[PDB]
Amino acid sequence: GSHMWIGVISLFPEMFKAITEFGVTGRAVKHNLLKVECWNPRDFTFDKHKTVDDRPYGGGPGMLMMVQPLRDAIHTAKAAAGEGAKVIYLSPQGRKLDQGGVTELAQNQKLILVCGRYEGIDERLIQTEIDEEWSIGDYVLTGGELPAMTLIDAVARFIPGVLGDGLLDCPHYTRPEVLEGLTVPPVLMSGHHEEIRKWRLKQSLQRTWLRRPELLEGLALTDEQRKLLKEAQAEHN
Amino acid sequence: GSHMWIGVISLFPEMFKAITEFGVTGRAVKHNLLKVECWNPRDFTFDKHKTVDDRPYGGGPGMLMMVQPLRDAIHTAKAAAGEGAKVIYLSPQGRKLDQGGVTELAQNQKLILVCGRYEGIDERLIQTEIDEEWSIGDYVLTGGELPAMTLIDAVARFIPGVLGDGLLDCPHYTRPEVLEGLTVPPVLMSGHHEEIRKWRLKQSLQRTWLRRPELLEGLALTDEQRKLLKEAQAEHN
Ligand SMILES: NC(=O)c1ccc(N[C@@H]2CC[C@H](c3ccccc3)C2)nc1
């Protein structure tokens, strides 16, 4: 009942149809749990060719986004959002997004996401217009739209109504009972709900330990988790 | 001249228009540097309602993707790809993507990306059909399509013709010379190309040190980098 409004600044607003028209996020939008509203800097140009890029001072190969159309688009989104809208710029130089960061961001009722293109935006716009910079990971992309949609999808899951502990997930199985000689673990067939819970937890702990052992350091395990992990490490050994 | 073919398995192939129809990646597709071909498990169903999900053994709240339609779609993509196509499943349990991982993946001429929906896919399909699992970051999303497009965008940049050192990027500036009282650093106006190079490098080192100091540990700095970093740390202090 705590819907979310997300403003987006992008030279390619139609990309956002990927989240607004399909799947769980598509349903969230249709049901007004989530609203995504886009402004395109191109609509804020005044020259005949609607120029949205500009040359960097100091030379170099790439172009930056042109300040005036971009700035005007941001101001327009801010005016539509009213008070309390945090403005976010998606870039590799930003704070690294993780699930904890998602839950933090999901506390905001209003967000404005600025999507960079070309070699990015003028540093002074970050100083004057941007509240926080975030990265979805340590890699470089051709635009901030995919990171913006990634963020929107992640926070959308925390909006009550949208959906139906620091560890990786357990393996899951569905029909058929045998698949290419591979059988479903009997415990999952046993109907014994407490045995199944402990099995999945143990699998989560083992999988986390094997694939992402650094994740376990961030955790204070319950006595039960400590035990199951020890068991798994014993059996693995 | 070393184009890339990417097969995609997704219940929502139209999402991929976000990368195939717009921007740099849109141009790569139009110019046949990049080809993205989608198969939808829904087309591989046989029941009247084209069912693509199934119940997990052992109970629990969510659904998994139905094995038969998904498996059949993967086999079809593999047959179209011929030999040498690495099959990748995008999930939070996968290897964490970073720029080094992108460059590795960009070595492949052919990739098949399997996009999970609901609570994911049957573990045995990962054993039998998937070559590698990758994550775009430590957060949970409603589907693997955004991570798939993120990966495609990142590797696309390494395809020769698509575009026009372990450190964060330097600040960049474009017109106007003064923006809300904030001036462009004179060195960038000086025309002195060696001074500008050293300034940007120093800024990259300082920014990396301040925001992502762990990144510097992964590096063996040149004498010049060591010097500039020391200078920056001195001035900051
Ligand atoms: N990892 C991420 O979250 C992410 C990745 C790429 C990306 N590219 C955008 C287009 C240019 C601009 C840019 C590009 C490179 C360096 C600085 C700024 C930002 N944005 C966000």
Ligand SMILES: NC(=O)c1ccc(N[C@@H]2CC[C@H](c3ccccc3)C2)nc1
């Ligand atoms: N961080 C990532 O790369 C990423 C994030 C989410 C995501 N969700 C997909 C839909 C369900 C399935 C799933 C979901 C949760 C746990 C396991 C499997 C995978 N996939 C990839």
